Amino acid sequence: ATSGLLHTSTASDKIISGDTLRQKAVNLGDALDGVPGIHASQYGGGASAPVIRGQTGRRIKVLNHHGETGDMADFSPDHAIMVDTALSQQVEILRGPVTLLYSSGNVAGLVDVADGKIPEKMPENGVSGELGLRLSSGNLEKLTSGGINIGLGKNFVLHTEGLYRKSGDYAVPRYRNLKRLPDSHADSQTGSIGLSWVGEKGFIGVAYSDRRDQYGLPAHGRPWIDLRNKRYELRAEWKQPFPGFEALRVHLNRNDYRHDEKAGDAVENFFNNQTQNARIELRHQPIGRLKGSWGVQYLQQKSSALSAISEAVKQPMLLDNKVQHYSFFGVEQANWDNFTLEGGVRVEKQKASIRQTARSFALSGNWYFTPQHKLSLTASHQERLPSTQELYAHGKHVATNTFEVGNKHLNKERSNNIELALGYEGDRWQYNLALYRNRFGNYIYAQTLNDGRGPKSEMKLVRYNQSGADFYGAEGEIYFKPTPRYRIGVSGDYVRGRLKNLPDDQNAPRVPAARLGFHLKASLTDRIDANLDYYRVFAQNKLARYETRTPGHHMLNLGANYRRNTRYGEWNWYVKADNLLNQSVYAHSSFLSDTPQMGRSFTGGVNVKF
Ligand SMILES: [Zn+2]
Ligand SMILES: [Zn+2]
Ligand SMILES: [Zn+2]
């Protein structure tokens, strides 16, 4: 776990390796689909938000290596997330006090994408990195990833990575009378440069990262988003700052983001986000077994979103605003031999210039009976301040086709959370189970209106209104291996929410359906690793104020890897087939509930590691 400076890993946490992510999809929400707990809020082939336990947007949090993504994915699911899955070293899903180190109101879980912009190490044999290439049938995709590390002398290490994606209109099963879904194509390209130092003591690295996606918009010339993302960042960390401390960490950032929701070659809605995050973390010495780490964060996001109409005539959806976070945070764990008790805190001040104070804190205890055998309980009272969107909304959004309305008098989102989990692994039997339960004293949500003033899949109207809520659900998995050479297992998840006491007792908006999963993986022999995954997704009968029924399909995915150690590093061949039954995959979690996802599709790729 690289996200936490202080390691406070709970039983609920999990880390997917990089080699597997090259075989998975490119989008964050779609690639992480299959893992128990997280569902995909797919909005075409361009963007997809990860729905962690029926939570999304600002309720979750995504970080681009110990720093803010600087994106507008939290605004709506159609917006792309500025994180590179195919270029990342490893993705890691985390919960507990470590959530309070970065963001407020992170009730579901943190998802830090560790990338290789800055090496932080002298590469083996001078140079290192990787190269990739894969084509998907029916999409039709053309991915070409890349990554290079160069030893520029004794202690300097230069890094240069590249990526390019080109997917047309993907195929749909039994959708009226269409072979491919119109306006669902998604082209993209990503590249980054980074120069770093190497220890002892530590590293002092800079990095530039550029991205430019071009994707259509299903469900509305031709609707499409053209975005540009420039990121000027700086990372540094060493093991000996000054006496009485074990580590010093700093992650400066400047993420310039922009996207144009166009229709043909004309711009209907402009967007902008001048993020510039700064943070100074430090991990003090162990004061008798117990360890901790404190830090300060200074963030400033000058975001805005205008339309084709001028400012003099109509009020924009999101006028120019200058948000400033002045956050203080810290964590402290106490290792009592076979029992770890950790507690985090976070206090931040908001200055919305065109001043309330947030106060979050958590506490978690982890009992280890006989490692690996992790029993863990967690509870976190988190208070998230409302964004400028939730208060100052008064315009139309052409991509979703929904008029967003705000409110001048709203309170902060307080939330008393609680969750427990039991993990185990020991050759023959392996299983991870977890229960979560979230109470919200104040839960702001997009209440579908209704009139109103007058007069008005056509044109939707929403207003951010307060409400009490109560979420609860179970999630986990189990793997019984008869022989280490093979691997068999079963997984499952469930989520349920309601809204109690309005200023009654209705269901939550867009709740993911239950998904049982069957798993197989046979590695015969050594190099060739075959596998099979059957995800049975049931229908969601419990619908919200203004929603419809959603199935309810039998998903089936197969795969077959192939390792090879030749000259110039390792080679990784792989062939993956998705949805052999060709079922009509309708996702209620996403906004595009009536639109079916990609049907039958194949994949064949090669990745050279070195
Ligand atoms: Zn870092
Ligand atoms: Zn007005
Ligand atoms: Zn949008």
* Distance (Å, whole) CA 81 – CA 441: 29
Q: What is the phi/psi pair of residue 101, to 5°?
A: -75, -25
Q: What resolution in angstrom units was achieved for this structure?
A: 4.5
| 264 C-alpha to ligand 3 centroid (Å) | 16
* Distance (Å, whole) CA 280 – CA 330: 11
Helix (H) / strand (E) element for 21: namely helix 18-21
At 35, list the tokens: 């893992």
| 69 C-alpha to ligand 1 centroid (Å) | 14
- Residue 387, CA distances (Å) to 223, 341, 459 in order: 27, 33, 24
* Distance (Å, whole) CA 500 – CA 498: 6
3-state secondary structure of 390: helix
- The experimental method behind these coordinates is X-ray
| 527 C-alpha to ligand 3 centroid (Å) | 45
| 11 C-alpha to ligand 1 centroid (Å) | 23
Residue found by looking up tokens 């301040």 in the block: 385
Ranges of beta strands (E only) in 10-86 are 14-17, 38-43, 47-52, 61-63
* Distance (Å, whole) CA 198 – CA 205: 9
577 near 559, Cβ under 8 Å?
Answer: yes
- Residue 386, CA distances (Å) to 159, 273, 432, 443 in order: 38, 17, 34, 10
- Ligand closest to the CA atom of residue 394: 2
187 near 169, Cβ under 8 Å?
Answer: no
Torsion over CA: 66, 72, 73, 74 (sign): positive
Which among 61, 73, 66, 145 has a CA at the least distance from the CA of 107? 61
Q: What is the phi/psi pair of residue 430, to 5°?
A: -140, 130
- Ligand closest to the CA atom of residue 77: 3
* Distance (Å, whole) CA 575 – CA 223: 33
State the amino acid at position 186 in one-letter form: A
Which among 333, 277, 443, 349 has a CA at the least distance from the CA of 96? 333
Q: What is the phi/psi pair of residue 29, to 5°?
A: -65, -40
| 2 C-alpha to ligand 1 centroid (Å) | 7
| 458 C-alpha to ligand 3 centroid (Å) | 17
3-state secondary structure of 28: helix
| 113 C-alpha to ligand 1 centroid (Å) | 11
| 316 C-alpha to ligand 2 centroid (Å) | 10
| 529 C-alpha to ligand 2 centroid (Å) | 60
| Residues forming beta bridges with residue 157, ordered by sequence position | 151, 196
SS (H, E, C) 170-214: CECCCCCCCCECCCCCEEEEEEEEEEECCCCCCEEEEEEEEECCE
Q: What is the phi/psi pair of residue 442, to 5°?
A: -140, 110
Tally of CB atoms within 10 A around 354 = 8
- Ligand closest to the CA atom of residue 72: 3
- Ligand closest to the CA atom of residue 119: 1
Q: What is the DSSP letter of 408?
A: S
| 591 C-alpha to ligand 3 centroid (Å) | 12
Q: What is the DSSP letter of 22?
A: T
Query: Which domains are present in the chain?
Result: 1-120 (2.170.130.10), 121-610 (no CATH)
Identify the burial level of 10 via C-beta atoms within 10 angstroms of its C-beta, where 0-12 means exposed, 13-18 middle and 19 or more buried. buried
146 near 134, Cβ under 8 Å?
Answer: no
| 258 C-alpha to ligand 2 centroid (Å) | 26
253 near 70, Cβ under 8 Å?
Answer: yes
Identify the burial level of 388 via C-beta atoms within 10 angstroms of its C-beta, where 0-12 means exposed, 13-18 middle and 19 or more buried. buried
Identify the burial level of 94 via C-beta atoms within 10 angstroms of its C-beta, where 0-12 means exposed, 13-18 middle and 19 or more buried. buried
Q: How would DSSP label each residue in 247-283?
A: EEEEEEEEEEEEEEEEESSSEEEEEEEEE--EEEEEE
Torsion over CA: 182, 183, 184, 190 (sign): positive
Which among 594, 607, 496, 585 has a CA at the least distance from the CA of 173? 585
| 30 C-alpha to ligand 2 centroid (Å) | 38
| 80 C-alpha to ligand 3 centroid (Å) | 9
- Ligand closest to the CA atom of residue 453: 2
| 270 C-alpha to ligand 2 centroid (Å) | 20
| 224 C-alpha to ligand 3 centroid (Å) | 10
252 near 45, Cβ under 8 Å?
Answer: no
At 542, list the tokens: 């419990």
Q: How many helices (DSSP H) and strands (DSSP E) are in the chain?
A: 3, 36
Which among 101, 81, 103 has a CA at the least distance from the CA of 91? 81
Residue found by looking up tokens 């359906």 in the block: 513
| 492 C-alpha to ligand 2 centroid (Å) | 47
Tally of CB atoms within 10 A around 330 = 21
At 493, list the tokens: 């998840």
| 556 C-alpha to ligand 3 centroid (Å) | 32
* Distance (Å, whole) CA 150 – CA 225: 35
SS (H, E, C) 279-347: EEEEEECCCCCCEEEEEEEEEEEEEEECECCCCCCCCCCECCCEEEEEEEEEEEEEECCCEEEEEEEEE
| 262 C-alpha to ligand 1 centroid (Å) | 36
* Distance (Å, whole) CA 584 – CA 586: 6
* Distance (Å, whole) CA 379 – CA 225: 40
452 prior amide bond cis, ω within 30? yes
Angle at 370 between CA 365 and CA 371, to 5 degrees: 75
Angle at 350 between CA 344 and CA 354, to 5 degrees: 160
Q: What is the phi/psi pair of residue 156, to 5°?
A: -90, 140
| 595 C-alpha to ligand 3 centroid (Å) | 18
At 342, list the tokens: 């950790």
Helix (H) / strand (E) element for 517: namely strand 515-522
Identify the burial level of 510 via C-beta atoms within 10 angstroms of its C-beta, where 0-12 means exposed, 13-18 middle and 19 or more buried. buried
Torsion over CA: 446, 449, 455, 460 (sign): positive
| 70 C-alpha to ligand 3 centroid (Å) | 15
* Distance (Å, whole) CA 151 – CA 198: 10
* Distance (Å, whole) CA 610 – CA 606: 13
- Residue 533: left if φ>0, alpha if ψ -120 to 50, beta else—which one? beta
| 237 C-alpha to ligand 3 centroid (Å) | 36
Torsion over CA: 169, 173, 178, 182 (sign): negative
| 263 C-alpha to ligand 1 centroid (Å) | 39
Rounded to 10 degrees, the C-alpha dihedral 172/178/182/186 comes to: 40
Q: What distance, in Å, lies between the first and last C-alpha atoms of the chain?
A: 22
DSSP β-ladder status, 486-500 and 468-480: antiparallel
Torsion over CA: 44, 48, 53, 54 (sign): negative
